[PDB]
Design a protein around this ligand. Structure first.
Ligand code: 5JE
Length: 273
């Protein structure tokens, strides 16, 4: 009633998102039409503000529906990558975006909040050269496997903030190469695409891996490929960072804060797109 619905923007996992105009304020919002527990969890997230997190303005539980009102941004990184496919994204911009996303995650993580589901369609950009995480924390409260960390794929229930670093590493490589890193069409094909590139994990590189719920002794045993073949022509700093983001063991995987001190971001700027 309070919002004139402008355009179906899309259709996430959680229901319809419309661009809509508040009538009592005139403001344009993204309006997402979606349990007592889910609504509390969602409301906690109104308190989670950072310039690289898309703002959740409101949560309206009414006529027993859930409406989430978010700040609106005109573009998403997926759509930006598709239109830069023949020229690519320049590296200072890739480097700026990665840095901002990492700031975003480091904030959220320091508050024990995870995203759990990062992907290019969740990363929104403005004309100012800001990139922001959208749908953050919505997974806990209430489809692409390509960004999914191996601990999740191997059936871990109690996964950590490292799952978001894994996802961001995947998106980073994709920005650079203009092709998804691990484009799996099932859970097992997803795991096996990761294994063909990074090697089948064992107790050497990942202590405890063999006792994970969906780990099978019968997994084919691939060797690790060189990262220079995976993300050419990213430089040595970039490759060093990327490999730390894609460590198998979630405990050895670089944290968002430690990644902000990496020499890849020595010379980081904020270019406009
Ligand atoms: C807030 C939340 C989700 C949103 N999704 C978009 N979007 C997707 C494609 N073009 C724009 N803007 C949003 C703003």
């Amino acid at each position: 009633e309070n919002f004139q619905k402008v355009e179906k923007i899309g259709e996430g996992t959680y229901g319809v998102v419309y661009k809509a105009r508040n009538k009592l304020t005139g403001e344009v919002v993204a309006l997402k039409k979606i349990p007592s527990t889910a609504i509390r969890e969602i409301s906690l997230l109104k308190e989670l503000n950072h310039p690289n997190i898309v703002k959740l303005l409101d949560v309206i539980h009414t006529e027993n529906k859930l409406y989430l009102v978010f700040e609106f941004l005109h573009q998403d990184l997926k759509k930006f990558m598709d239109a830069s496919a023949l020229t690519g994204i320049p590296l200072p911009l890739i480097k700026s975006y990665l840095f901002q996303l990492l700031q975003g995650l480091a904030f959220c993580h320091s508050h024990r909040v995870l995203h759990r589901d990062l992907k290019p369609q969740n990363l929104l950009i403005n004309t100012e050269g800001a990139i922001k995480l959208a749908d953050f924390g919505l997974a806990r409260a209430f489809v692409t496997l390509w960004y999914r960390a191996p601990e999740i794929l191997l059936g871990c229930k109690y996964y950590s903030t490292a799952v978001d670093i894994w996802s961001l590493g995947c998106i980073f490589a994709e920005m650079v190469t203009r092709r998804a890193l691990f484009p799996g069409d099932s859970e097992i094909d997803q795991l096996f695409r990761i294994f063909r590139t990074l090697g089948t994990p064992d107790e050497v590189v990942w202590p405890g891996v063999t006792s994970m719920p969906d780990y099978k002794p019968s997994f084919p045993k691939w060797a690790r490929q060189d990262f220079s073949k995976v993300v050419p022509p990213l430089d040595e700093d970039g490759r060093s960072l990327l490999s730390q983001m894609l460590h198998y063991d979630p405990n050895k995987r670089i944290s968002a804060k430690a990644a902000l001190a990496h020499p890849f971001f020595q010379d980081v700027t904020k270019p406009v797109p």
